[PDB]
């Protein structure tokens, strides 16, 4: 996109001293490493799924049992529902400029609290929620070479095996590691708050 | 396209209060998860449809009866459906000011109701009947992993297996659950009209 | 393309009330029905092509005898075709506007009627060409699941199957209809303009 | 390319009145039917390029002896030719336009003479020398069904079949009489001048 | 991305004599090599591994073992993580301008000290971490022709070949001696500094 | 690229009257070429790399032997390498005269000479060696239909077929012929300039 600048200049603009930090961390270590290196190693995940079995069908429902939905396509869910809470309250200030200036620091002072607070407050159960899904469904962040099947039509069990276990499972530790980053400087800017008003 | 921001900031500055929600819903989570993360899931949809037989073009006349139109197809056409209504009105607004000026929060007063309360109800009756048929073509909004086929030249019944039914499944829930967040929301916009005007 | 919006745009400034309303449904229900939608659903019209036979080249001859042109490259040869006459005339209104400014609805006063009343006859006879290519090649709108063949070299008559032909004859019904409006829109303005001058 | 509007417009500007018909001919009818259109026919040409045979190699000869030179290749280099001389030629209007200003319709007054006047005959020599070599290197402007191939290491003679040959044929016809425009049009723009100056 | 030349001379803007020169080593030779030519050098890598056996697995497995992370995707890494120290404080040059503005060679004068040490500092840390990992993981930077396997379920040795591997070595030399350069290029940097302020 | 006219055209205002030509010839005659016609010609390489053999690895090897680095790649480094000398110059050529303005024919006058003079020699050095390279490496520069490989692990001699030899021949000739021109064309900049200091 052309007016990559545009967004992140603007969101850039309308943030708090962290606020500033956590937007390079989600564009450089998140949003880059899925586009440029994740999604391509992702892209034959089926095409070289391997079952030794000459039972028609046994690979499809092997494959669709153990991977109900793809690293990627959830890392894509993530980053899209984080993003809006922050672009959201950052097209609010700019409206609150906008006021302003009709009669560079953003500082939170009156109904810019309960936006602020919730978004980062979202953000957080947001995150949490992925990374708990994440580990309950794939029960670990570690990819197996070898997946034991036996869902219909599949004889007994099937032997299977996956396309790049180790790399896949190197950018999922990358990608877990910075999202509990961004937890950790989520909850800091929490506390920078809760000491303001409330203490 | 590299005047996304051109017309999303077009139509955003001619819209109401919830029109302006309306407007975040649709482009976020449903054209970038149609664009980002849907269409690759249906990429091999007739690739790896799996029959079991020998028979040379069944494989071909069972996934056209049971896919009569792919699901990312319909999504497609339901989004350029419901997106016209609102944006010629929103340049029907531009028009409208255009003339004033020649002599920012949009107000409806004069010839705007007969075709905003329009734009709203057309979008209502565009997103229902997409809706009636996904539902009706689909019998429900689960994907199976076998479909049983007996069309010509198929012998008797044949067994036939779909990819990723799981993931398919999972995003034509999402899907219809935002869509009929978006008929809600303009409904809502309705009863705020129909109140000042005839009650 | 990223200057859509400039000659959109400057084709839109430059014409009349009716031929407005003809730029959305050449732009919106044609071209972007055809990009997004259309393209990938012929992807594999070859590819999934299935003769029953063992006859080297049958394949090859068969597909060819059925499908001489593709459905999308006619589609994609009739836009260009009838943007052509919208585009030269748009421009020539910017010339003659550009003579009396060097000295915003568009009036046909002198020299215009020649070129517009054309450009609108032209662009009547360039769609009903292609919609007659269309019915007498394709002896119709519906696409057929089994064609059969008997060009050489294969011996005597060959059964053969098409991909995804319901899918086809959606979207085959959806531009005829559309290109069909488009001709009654054009008409239209034929009559306005004939009853101006001629009656 | 995003700059096309800008190049298309200044060479646009620095063009004669016959010239300006030229660089639609140019642009609409012979880059975006390359583009849109055929070079999707062609890129499937080797893939089923289908041998009658079961030697090892054979496929790769017969096809090498028999497409040298791809059609779309062919014409991405003979667009790239012709495109030339008329660039050089406005670049140098510019500078001759920005030596008068420093101190818009364009007319030849004095060296000026001499670079368009070679940049048109060029350009008809260049064009001839590509529809000659269209002509004797495939022997005509039909493309085949079958051809017979007895190239080492294929034994005797072998049977070979094309992909999409009524296609490939339609789209043949179309450039040549289109590139036939082109030269029949640079001959009118020498016939201007050649009264001009020498009778 | 169209907002390159922005990024880009933003950042020759903000950096010093040598750094400069660290630019286009990092932009021309490094990303332009990556992108233009090497990643479509490794486009079949697990394609064309091809392993001399029968046992359905082996071939996943085998790959799986010797290309724990590809090459291009460990690149894709080095380079983002060393774009982010250079970007961070240029981005703070910026703002330490932005200051005096509202009150072109860049100058270390006060806290800039020590986010333009620690900037180079890190640099040359993360690009021989990379360069360590990249000897440690491949043993050396030569591609083999072939790998004897015997992970399960391979039976006893596999031989297995590797997709061009001759290609894979020459971009690779390529590579890791241009890092070499920037961390040369680096230690310079270090060392004017160092005798400006501790000599 | 978007910022292809910026870049393109800022060079084209810091040269000499015979570097605007060898701007032409480099840009519209090499790099053209290589995007719009010759990459895709290459696209099947090692696809259709056909070898009469039941050895499993042995086309693997043969293929790597005889095409250590393809052609399209091997232009891709040069035209990189021949790249960067123009526009580090045409970078110093823009500070030089930033200097004078903060106190349009290109002129060589004082440090200048020591830059243009190297950049030219540079140029003539790089292209030289390549082609150098291209002859050495490929024994001339006609691609050869069969190539005959007995590198382990093929057993005694083995027939190996090449795709589209006579395509890859037209380019390679056509990409070396213009590649001579540039070298003369630079070596008479060399001559201009020898002439006015040292003569």
Same mark, same amino acid.
């Given at each position: 996109? *052309?007016?990559?600048?545009? @967004?992140? *200049? %603007?969101?850039?603009?309308?943030?708090?001293?962290? %606020?500033?930090? &956590?937007?390079? $961390? /989600?564009?450089?270590?998140?949003?880059?490493?899925?586009?440029?290196?994740?999604?391509?190693?992702? %892209?034959?995940?089926?095409?070289?799924?391997?079952?030794? !079995?000459?039972?028609? %069908?046994?690979?499809? $429902?092997?494959?669709?049992?153990?991977?109900?939905?793809?690293?990627?396509? /959830?890392?894509? /869910?993530?980053?899209?529902?984080?993003? !809006?809470?922050?672009?959201?309250?950052?097209?609010?200030?700019?409206?609150?400029?906008? #006021?302003?200036?009709?009669?560079?620091?953003?500082?939170? #002072?009156?109904?810019? &609290?309960? !936006?602020?607070?919730?978004?980062?407050?979202?953000?957080? @159960?947001? #995150?949490?929620?992925?990374?708990?899904?994440?580990?309950?469904?794939?029960? *670990?962040?570690?990819?197996?070479?070898?997946?034991?099947?036996?869902?219909?039509?599949?004889?007994? !069990?099937?032997?299977?095996?996956?396309?790049?276990?180790? #790399?896949?499972?190197?950018?999922?530790?990358?990608? @877990?590691?910075?999202? *509990?980053?961004?937890? /950790?400087?989520?909850?800091?800017?929490?506390?920078?708050?809760?000491?303001?008003?409330?203490?």
């Amino acid at each position: 996109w *052309g007016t990559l600048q545009t @967004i992140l *200049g %603007g969101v850039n603009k309308h943030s708090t001293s962290i %606020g500033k930090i &956590w937007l390079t $961390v /989600l564009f450089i270590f998140r949003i880059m490493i899925l586009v440029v290196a994740a999604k391509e190693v992702w %892209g034959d995940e089926q095409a070289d799924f391997v079952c030794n !079995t000459l039972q028609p %069908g046994c690979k499809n $429902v092997c494959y669709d049992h153990y991977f109900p939905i793809s690293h990627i396509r /959830l890392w894509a /869910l993530q980053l899209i529902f984080v993003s !809006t809470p922050a672009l959201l309250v950052a097209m609010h200030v700019a409206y609150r400029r906008h #006021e302003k200036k009709r009669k560079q620091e953003v500082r939170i #002072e009156g109904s810019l &609290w309960w !936006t602020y607070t919730s978004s980062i407050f979202f953000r957080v @159960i947001f #995150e949490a929620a992925f990374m708990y899904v994440f580990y309950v469904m794939y029960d *670990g962040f570690s990819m197996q070479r070898l997946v034991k099947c036996n869902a219909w039509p599949c004889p007994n !069990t099937v032997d299977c095996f996956v396309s790049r276990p180790t #790399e896949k499972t190197v950018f999922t530790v990358f990608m @877990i590691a910075v999202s *509990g980053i961004c937890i /950790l400087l989520n909850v800091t800017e929490l506390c920078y708050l809760l000491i303001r008003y409330c203490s």
